[PDB]
Amino acid sequence: ECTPGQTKKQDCNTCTCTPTGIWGCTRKACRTT
């Protein structure tokens, strides 16, 4: 549950808050953790 249009990062992937109120995130494998 997020406000549509907001952005965040989960590690190295960018996430976008879509119109349906959920996070769409890219699918890279993030290395340096």
Partner: protein
């Protein structure tokens, strides 16, 4: 890859793994001796020198043939998640033959038909949020989800005509983090897309989203 199984030697002659700074990162598709097609987000904003590619191996750590990058071409209109393809010119030319071949491409302006079958492959996590990173390639077969349905899951503006989706209503089968850029193909092994984005992985009523080779054929032919 979630809900899939070990891929076999020769199932995807053209698939490559792409490391960044010596770690796993994305997959790709060899189009010719010096060209790899991956997702724009795998390479955009980053130093081209960090990237190595591996072709001709089920393993992401050994075997096959490797190459660093000579240049990178991001789609001119890559925006948000849309037009999410990049062309990578390779520093080492990788001939076809033996375990490697080149990808044939979905027809210009084609669009994956809802309900039809497609298979995606990669070295990504096997569960949503999983600490897993497979050494040997994985693969899953999933149905195409109509754009109208995907637009219902994500929102009309979130899903464009340069994207298409795949997944099963009740979840269970998907690409996931680490599969980005990697091939999804039809049953002729035609490259119809590259892994791009999604809400989690393999969730019920949340499809995997793919950059569409058919919809973006112009870009590819120009820079390949």
């Amino acid at each position: 890859i979630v809900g899939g199984t070990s891929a076999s030697a020769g199932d995807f002659p053209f698939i490559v793994s792409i490391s960044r700074n010596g770690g796993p990162w994305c997959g790709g598709s060899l189009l010719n001796a010096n060209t790899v097609l991956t997702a724009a987000h795998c390479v955009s904003g980053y130093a081209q020198s960090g990237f190595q590619i591996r072709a001709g191996s089920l393993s992401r750590t050994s075997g096959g043939i490797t190459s660093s990058l000579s240049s990178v071409r991001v789609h001119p209109s890559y925006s948000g998640n849309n037009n999410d393809l990049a062309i990578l010119k390779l520093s080492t030319s990788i001939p076809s033959g033996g375990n490697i071949g080149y990808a044939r491409l979905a027809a210009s302006g084609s669009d994956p038909v809802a309900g039809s079958s497609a298979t995606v492959a990669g070295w990504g996590a096997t569960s949503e949020g999983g600490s897993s990173t497979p050494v040997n390639l994985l693969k899953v077969t999933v149905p195409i989800v109509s754009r109208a349905t995907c637009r219902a899951q994500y929102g009309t503006s979130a899903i464009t005509n340069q994207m298409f989706c795949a997944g099963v209503s009740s979840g269970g089968k998907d690409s996931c983090q680490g599969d980005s850029g990697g091939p999804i193909v039809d049953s002729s092994n035609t490259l119809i897309g590259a892994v791009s984005w999604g809400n989690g992985c393999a969730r019920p009523n949340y499809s995997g989203v793919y950059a569409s080779v058919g919809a973006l054929r112009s870009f590819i032919d120009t820079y390949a």
